Amino acid sequence: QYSIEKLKKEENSLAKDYYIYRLLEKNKISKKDAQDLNSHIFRYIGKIKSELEKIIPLKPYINPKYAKCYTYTANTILDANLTCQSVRLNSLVFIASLNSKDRTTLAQTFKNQRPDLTNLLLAFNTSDPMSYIVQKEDINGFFKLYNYSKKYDLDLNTSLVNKLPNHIGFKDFAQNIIIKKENPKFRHSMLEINPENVSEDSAFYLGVNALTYDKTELAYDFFKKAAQSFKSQSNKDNAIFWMWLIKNNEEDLKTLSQSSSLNIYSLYAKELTNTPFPKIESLNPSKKKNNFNMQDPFAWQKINKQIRDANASQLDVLAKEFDTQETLPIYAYILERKNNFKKHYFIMPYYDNIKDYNKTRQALILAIARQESRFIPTAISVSYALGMMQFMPFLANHIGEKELKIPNFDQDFMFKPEIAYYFGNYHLNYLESRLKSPLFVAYAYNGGIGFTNRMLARNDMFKTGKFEPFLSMELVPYQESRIYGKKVLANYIVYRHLLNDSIKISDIFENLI
Numbered sequence: 001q002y003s004i005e006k007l008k009k010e011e012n013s014l015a016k017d018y019y020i021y022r023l024l025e026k027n028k029i030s031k032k033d034a035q036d037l038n039s040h041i042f043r044y045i046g047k048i049k050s051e052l053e054k055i056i057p058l059k060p061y062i063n064p065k066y067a068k069c070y071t072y073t074a075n076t077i078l079d080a081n082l083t084c085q086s087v088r089l090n091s092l093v094f095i096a097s098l099n100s101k102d103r104t105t106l107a108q109t110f111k112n113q114r115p116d117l118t119n120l121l122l123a124f125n126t127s128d129p130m131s132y133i134v135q136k137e138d139i140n141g142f143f144k145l146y147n148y149s150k151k152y153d154l155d156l157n158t159s160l161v162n163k164l165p166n167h168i169g170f171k172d173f174a175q176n177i178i179i180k181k182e183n184p185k186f187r188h189s190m191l192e193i194n195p196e197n198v199s200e201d202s203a204f205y206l207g208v209n210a211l212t213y214d215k216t217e218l219a220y221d222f223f224k225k226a227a228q229s230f231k232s233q234s235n236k237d238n239a240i241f242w243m244w245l246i247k248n249n250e251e252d253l254k255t256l257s258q259s260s261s262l263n264i265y266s267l268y269a270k271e272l273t274n275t276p277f278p279k280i281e282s283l284n285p286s287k288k289k290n291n292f293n294m295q296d297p298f299a300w301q302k303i304n305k306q307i308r309d310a311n312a313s314q315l316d317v318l319a320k321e322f323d324t325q326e327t328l329p330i331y332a333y334i335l336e337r338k339n340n341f342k343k344h345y346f347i348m349p350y351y352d353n354i355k356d357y358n359k360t361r362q363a364l365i366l367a368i369a370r371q372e373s374r375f376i377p378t379a380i381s382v383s384y385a386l387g388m389m390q391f392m393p394f395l396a397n398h399i400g401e402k403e404l405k406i407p408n409f410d411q412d413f414m415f416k417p418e419i420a421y422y423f424g425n426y427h428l429n430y431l432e433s434r435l436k437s438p439l440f441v442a443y444a445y446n447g448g449i450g451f452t453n454r455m456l457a458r459n460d461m462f463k464t465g466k467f468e469p470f471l472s473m474e475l476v477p478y479q480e481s482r483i484y485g486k487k488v489l490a491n492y493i494v495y496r497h498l499l500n501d502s503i504k505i506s507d508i509f510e511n512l513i
């Protein structure tokens with residue numbers, strides 16, 4: 001427990017944020033203590049911001065140069081000077097609120113200097129502003145209208161759709177409409193995007209899009225462009241896997257099987273080609289401990305910052321300092337940076353707490369902890385999930401107080417490895433009993449069993465099909481859970497291998513359908 005006075009002495013960090021949030025939620029921050037407090041908050045977002053704003057609303061913040069502009073309304077905007085008129089017309093809701101005669105007037109006013117404003121004003125004088133903006137091929141207007149309302153939907157011709165990728169909004173547009181299976185005319189139109197005009201994630205999602213319309217040759221061309229342009233080897237491998245699945249070129253599979261990235265795709269390719277399992281590093285420090293406190297959340301925030309700012313030389317000093325059994329998770333974390341992310345570290349710390357579970361359970365626990373925290377006992381997420389297994393306070397308290405009735409339980413007990421692994425086992429029993437597959441369990445661990453149940457109830461998810469279950473894995477509608485599932489599944493395969501309880505990843509894939 002930390003008073004606001006003592007917290008204010010600590011460096012700004014997620015740990016300090018968490019402990020400030022704990023005071024706010026227990027009503028221990030007075031209006032007077034609240035006055036300076038946002039200079040003490042490292043990430044002023046979500047619940048900490050809503051809680052603080054209940055004590056001290058934000059009057060902030062309109063830019064003082066344009067103050068006067070915000071004194072007009074739709075009824076008086078024709079009395080405003082030209083700068084004021086153009087500032088207020090940045091808002092499409094403001095434009096929508098205008099009467100049509102004033103939209104006509106303002107459109108004429110702005111036609112020479114701001115034809116973008118003209119196009120939007122006249123668009124809103126029609127019953128379908130999107131159709132007007134599309135006829136003009138006003139790309140900036142298109143994205144403004146999309147951000148205003150996701151309900152507009154229209155066919156887009158080859159020329160227009162090939163202009164969209166140059167706008168910063170394209171990537172989120174494409175991803176959202178493909179994954180959410182919305183805006184079907186937009187989605188169908190995006191089949192005519194030239195792969196030459198897209199790259200990376202956008203190219204990849206356009207591949208996925210093409211597969212949903214069974215346009216396999218277009219899909220291949222998008223995935224090939226993605227494989228060529230993606231920065232990360234793990235993403236390139238995902239793209240190459242699709243190239244292989246669609247066109248069956250055995251050079252694509254061979255390239256995938258020789259990847260330096262360990263991921264589900266490279267593991268699968270290795271299995272299909274009878275390639276040996278990738279080499280896993282063995283870390284076995286003989287030193288037992290050092291002076292570092294693995295149970296101090298503030299100390300972790302500080303050493304993490306140091307490690308991530310350390311030059312090649314400082315990483316070697318830190319490596320030596322943390323080369324002990326007690327600080328093994330910090331050691332592996334340092335080595336991962338020091339070796340430029342080329343070696344595979346799959347540690348098993350605090351193993352005494354799980355050695356009596358069966359090996360398949362051990363592997364799933366380890367797989368989850370590796371992705372959740374990298375085994376850092378005092379890990380804290382941006383949403384204040386806690387410890388090695390990244391329990392949200394709600395769940396920690398439900399399990400620790402309601403279910404297990406641990407005397408004097410506090411959510412900070414999640415920072416103790418014994419508790420993290422015990423609670424993790426407890427919750428994984430609940431999930432696995434309902435879902436079975438380690439991939440589904442992973443999705444429910446990160447995203448909730450409600451989300452997972454709803455996804456699996458759909459007719460179009462994890463059912464039989466030409467490109468299943470891989471296609472479904474690309475369409476998991478929450479990006480954090482989609483990524484999380486792929487990573488945890490790879491880790492699970494590795495840990496099962498390391499525990500002498502190997503499973504073929506092909507058997508996992510068969511059990512998904």
Ligand SMILES: CC(=O)N[C@H]1[C@H](OC[C@H]2CCC(=O)N2)O[C@H](CO)[C@@H](O)[C@@H]1O
Nearest residue numbers: 371372373374379380381382385390484
């Ligand atoms: C400490 C923390 O923020 N962990 C989050 C993790 O972060 C991934 C990387 C970066 C930091 C780390 O330990 N692993 O991503 C998971 C989703 O994939 C989340 O559920 C976890 O809460």
Ligand SMILES: CC(=O)N[C@H]1[C@H](OC[C@H]2CCC(=O)N2)O[C@H](CO)[C@@H](O)[C@@H]1O
Nearest residue numbers: 385389390391392395445446447448449
């Ligand atoms: C381990 C845990 O607390 N999981 C919960 C998750 O926590 C969000 C982040 C933290 C770490 C992670 O993997 N997901 O939030 C879901 C949505 O509210 C809940 O349904 C889950 O039970």
